[PDB]
Amino acid sequence: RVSPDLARARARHLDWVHAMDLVRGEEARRRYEFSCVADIGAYGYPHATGADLDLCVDVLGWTFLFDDQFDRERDALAVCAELTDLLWKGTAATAASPPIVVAFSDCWERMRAGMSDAWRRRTVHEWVDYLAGWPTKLADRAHGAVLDPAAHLRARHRTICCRPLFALAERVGGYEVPRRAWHSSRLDGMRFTTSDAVIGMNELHSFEKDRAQHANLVLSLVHHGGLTGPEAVTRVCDLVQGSIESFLRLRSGLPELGRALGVEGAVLDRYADALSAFCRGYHDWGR
Amino acid sequence: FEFAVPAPSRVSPDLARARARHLDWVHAMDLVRYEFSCVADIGAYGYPHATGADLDLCVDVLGWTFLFDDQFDRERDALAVCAELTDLLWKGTATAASPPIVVAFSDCWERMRAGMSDAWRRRTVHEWVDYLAGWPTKLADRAHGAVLDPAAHLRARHRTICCRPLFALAERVGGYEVPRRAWHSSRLDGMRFTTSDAVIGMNELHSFEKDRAQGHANLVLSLVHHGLTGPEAVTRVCDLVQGSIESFLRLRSGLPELGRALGVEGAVLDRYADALSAFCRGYHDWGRGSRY
Numbered sequence A: 001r002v003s004p005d006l007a008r009a010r011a012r013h014l015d016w017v018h019a020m021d022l023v024r025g026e027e028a029r030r031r032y033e034f035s036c037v038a039d040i041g042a043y044g045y046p047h048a049t050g051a052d053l054d055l056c057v058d059v060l061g062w063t064f065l066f067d068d069q070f071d072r073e074r075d076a077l078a079v080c081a082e083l084t085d086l087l088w089k090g091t092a093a094t095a096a097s098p099p100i101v102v103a104f105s106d107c108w109e110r111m112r113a114g115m116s117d118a119w120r121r122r123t124v125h126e127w128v129d130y131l132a133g134w135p136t137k138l139a140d141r142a143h144g145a146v147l148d149p150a151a152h153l154r155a156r157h158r159t160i161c162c163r164p165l166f167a168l169a170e171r172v173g174g175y176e177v178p179r180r181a182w183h184s185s186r187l188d189g190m191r192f193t194t195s196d197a198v199i200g201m202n203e204l205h206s207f208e209k210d211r212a213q214h215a216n217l218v219l220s221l222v223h224h225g226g227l228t229g230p231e232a233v234t235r236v237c238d239l240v241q242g243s244i245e246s247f248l249r250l251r252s253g254l255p256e257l258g259r260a261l262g263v264e265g266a267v268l269d270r271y272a273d274a275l276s277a278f279c280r281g282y283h284d285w286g287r
Numbered sequence B: 001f002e003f004a005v006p007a008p009s010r011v012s013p014d015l016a017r018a019r020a021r022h023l024d025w026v027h028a029m030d031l032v033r034y035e036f037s038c039v040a041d042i043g044a045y046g047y048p049h050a051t052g053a054d055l056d057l058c059v060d061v062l063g064w065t066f067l068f069d070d071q072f073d074r075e076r077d078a079l080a081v082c083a084e085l086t087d088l089l090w091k092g093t094a095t096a097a098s099p100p101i102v103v104a105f106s107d108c109w110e111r112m113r114a115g116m117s118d119a120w121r122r123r124t125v126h127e128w129v130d131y132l133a134g135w136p137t138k139l140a141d142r143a144h145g146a147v148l149d150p151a152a153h154l155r156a157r158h159r160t161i162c163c164r165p166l167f168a169l170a171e172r173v174g175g176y177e178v179p180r181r182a183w184h185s186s187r188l189d190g191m192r193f194t195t196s197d198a199v200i201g202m203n204e205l206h207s208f209e210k211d212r213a214q215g216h217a218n219l220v221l222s223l224v225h226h227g228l229t230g231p232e233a234v235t236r237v238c239d240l241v242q243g244s245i246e247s248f249l250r251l252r253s254g255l256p257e258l259g260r261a262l263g264v265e266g267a268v269l270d271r272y273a274d275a276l277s278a279f280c281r282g283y284h285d286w287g288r289g290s291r292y
């Protein structure tokens, strides 16, 4: 599925990256439009329309443009610190703030609107835990060692940015998963297995680019597992397929979770639908 | 059950004074309204070179984590405490209205952050807050009552065991900060992770009989349920601990190259590695000797 409001949202988002001074110039605008990053929000949140869809598109595009920064290391680290302070303390973007910070704040003021203090606290923490992965990326690049597969995955569970994007699904879907359910290992496991699937797919999409330039799960498996490329790729495919099977087993336990905790079944089913829609959306967009 | 942790058995020589002071501190903090548990000793095992006020801080922080844990074993109160501590850490601010567990944490944190750089404070704040994040999960899972699968149990434990803030504490009381470019590397993060895995695994074995008797979560029990016989599950957990120690040592053998690649002095990396190993060995020796 794709949101029916994509055409308007795409054109608006291309103006927004220009207005935020993130994508400057005819060549950069064309490159950015060709990348179809301006569309993923409509695949990952296929029921969002209007301003909700704009927020999804802007946030997704922001994460791509943030990622582009690292590929001027002190500048990127300075951004991580300014964003951390904005999230932790509510410090405002200023005229001296770089475009990437101004644009994040523009997204975040919309994303936190209408959400409870509890949701804001857990979502702030997820944003900052995503930011915590980027110093690691820079340090690992400077080190130059091939990460072992498990260490690569621990790092990517931060930089892939799934958990803030799952929080965004609540914000645009119009609900908050009740606290007693959201913190359960059953739902955290659904977040974790969805993230594993998305990471695995992304590692395969990114393989050739990463090898030409960066860390990649396939390369780590070759180096540390003594696997051939084909064998390592099979291992990643098995990770994705096993993560989907695990997600489905957990999802079949949501009625019992609802009964045990006194939580309405509808909100649990809706949240699980959002996680699977994000995964399916990234998969379809990536093809 | 004994494991070949790569650090010698040692205890701080200042344990006697530190223990008696800590019991006075928990009373003055109005936390105990505990001595017999011997929790007041782990700090001298986990930080065997600390003395004086440095050791007191270690003992107080460790004891605080056990007394915080006791809250869960008034759930709305515990969540309100997590929220207040999170805001205190994030915003850089305890007040007269704060409950005793918050006053006591702030008492610890003001000593723990003293003399440390803004960079260290930022990463350590994040570690403290990630630990606070595990307790809503512990309360939710208790209310749910389902047997966690082994991987989910370990993911939850990696927050609540409180190893990462305690590794940061080793820098504070040791007198050094690992340079930023090395601290954030996956090489050192992997040494933190494998140390934590080993401590978790040892604790699951130490606690097995109690957890099963009292019907609480335990990795061995999760493996029986979702996997194994009792003995097979115990062997699996022992293999986890030994594999984590072996992985830590393989990572440690790369510290000279890390130091050369990053322009970081070899001495501070070895000192950090020794602190992680001393913590693991300290927990090993302490846990092997009444709580369980």
Ligand SMILES: CC(C)=CCC/C(C)=C(\F)COP(=O)(O)OP(=O)(O)O
Residues within 6 Å of the ligand: A060, A063, A064, A067, A068, A071, A160, A161, A162, A198, A202, A206, A209, A282
């Ligand atoms: C939204 C999710 C779940 C995943 C996307 C992860 C990102 C930001 C990339 F793979 C960057 O892709 P890109 O084509 O921009 O690669 P380069 O920036 O290296 O050219």
Ligand SMILES: [Cl-]
Residues within 6 Å of the ligand: A178, A179, A180, A181
């Ligand atoms: Cl609730």
Ligand SMILES: [Cl-]
Residues within 6 Å of the ligand: B179, B180, B181, B182
């Ligand atoms: Cl540095």
Ligand SMILES: [Mg+2]
Residues within 6 Å of the ligand: A064, A065, A067, A068
């Ligand atoms: Mg890009």
